[PDB]
Amino acid sequence: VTLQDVLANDALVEFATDKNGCRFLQEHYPTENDNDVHQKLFRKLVEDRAIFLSLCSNMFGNFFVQRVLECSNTEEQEILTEHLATDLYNLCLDKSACRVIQLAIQKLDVHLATRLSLELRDTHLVRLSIDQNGNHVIQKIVKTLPVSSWTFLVDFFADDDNLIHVCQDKYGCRVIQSTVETLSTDAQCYQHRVILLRSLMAGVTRNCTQLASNEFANYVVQHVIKCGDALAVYRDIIIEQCLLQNLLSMSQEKYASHVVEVAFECAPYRLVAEMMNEIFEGRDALDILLFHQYGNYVVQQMIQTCVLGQNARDQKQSEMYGMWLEKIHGRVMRNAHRLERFSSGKKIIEALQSMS
RNA sequence: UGUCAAAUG
């Protein structure tokens, strides 16, 4: 069995759609673009546009299309880009063909991959971003191509309704986070990515209460708070304008209590002190959270924040961390008999008894 | 005691 038999029998489809036949095609396809067998196999692949797209959508044929993409030059890439463009939206939703698309974003010349990226603008961008296959195509574009090739995505997610529908989705929350990560990492003299990030993050902070409460978008809100210097201004905006004056309610929520936790873990001192003051100065708020099924984890993070903050340098901050830790220690010791009956109050006591 | 956390042979 040779490749010359495959060409003479006109049996590219039969080999490519078979598991062992495609592996034979992958291993023996000549890599050089001026090889005669290479050109004859490439012609058989792209002569019939419908045959090519069916091979892209085939469980085994897509691996051969990917191999052709790896060895492709600019002339071959021009033909492949034209074929993929005619059915690009459905190829991004297909289980096999989205892997052809994802490799094409990496492998094609940037102006060819930019053509495929920009073609998605007039399609259904929410349906792409939430598809089990399509969300990987969007993230591949964002992580690989220059921002000029996908700036329409930033404009699209600047609408609050688009952002909420995508960010609350199981897969779309990854799409929002990958866009945020790419725009927030660098530096740039004129800060074009900074301005683009500000447009995207404005929707995040406007709808942060709904997003922190959501089963999937709470991960995105946590990422902004936990990120560090890249998203530090947006972390502080989220804490000041959403979390403050709502800490008692959010610490009692199934998903938003995780947001309150990472805020206590990562806020600057000036915001930690406002958060501590809200809990302590309004059965008070600390008593509610100590016995709460979600709020007890917030108290445990409040304890760990004060334990680490005692070893700070400011020494006026370090006094306040000890003052807050002792105030938690006083309230736990008063209610220790009731707290010991459950694992939540036991873990709080075990954290306090490691020191005293 | 707390989270549905990403698609091919």
- Distance in angstroms (rounded) separating the CA atoms of residues A272 and A9: 74
A59 touches strand B (CB under 7 A): yes
Give the domain ranges of chain A.
232-356
Nearest Cα to Cα of residue A176 among A154, A192, A195: A154
> Exposed, middle or buried: residue A59 (CB in 10 Å: 0-12, 13-18, 19+)?
exposed
Residues 262-291 in A having a C-beta less than 7 A from any atom of strand B are none
Q: Provide the CA A253 to C1' B1 distance, Å, integer.
A: 14
Tell me the C-alpha to C-alpha distance, in Å, between residue A260 and each of A58, A61, A211: 46, 48, 13
**Residues written for chain A:** 356
Name the residue closest to the C1' of B2 by its CA.
A294
Query: A232-356: what fold?
Result: Leucine-rich Repeat Variant (1.25.10)
Q: Which residue is nearest to nucleotide B7 (CA to C1')?
A: A133
Q: Is the CB of A182 under 7 A from strand B?
A: no
- What is the C-alpha separation between A108 and A76, in angstroms, rounded? 10
CA distance A322 to A128: 50
Please report, rounded to whole angstroms, the spatial distance between the CA atom of protein residue A142 and the C1' atom of nucleotide B7: 17
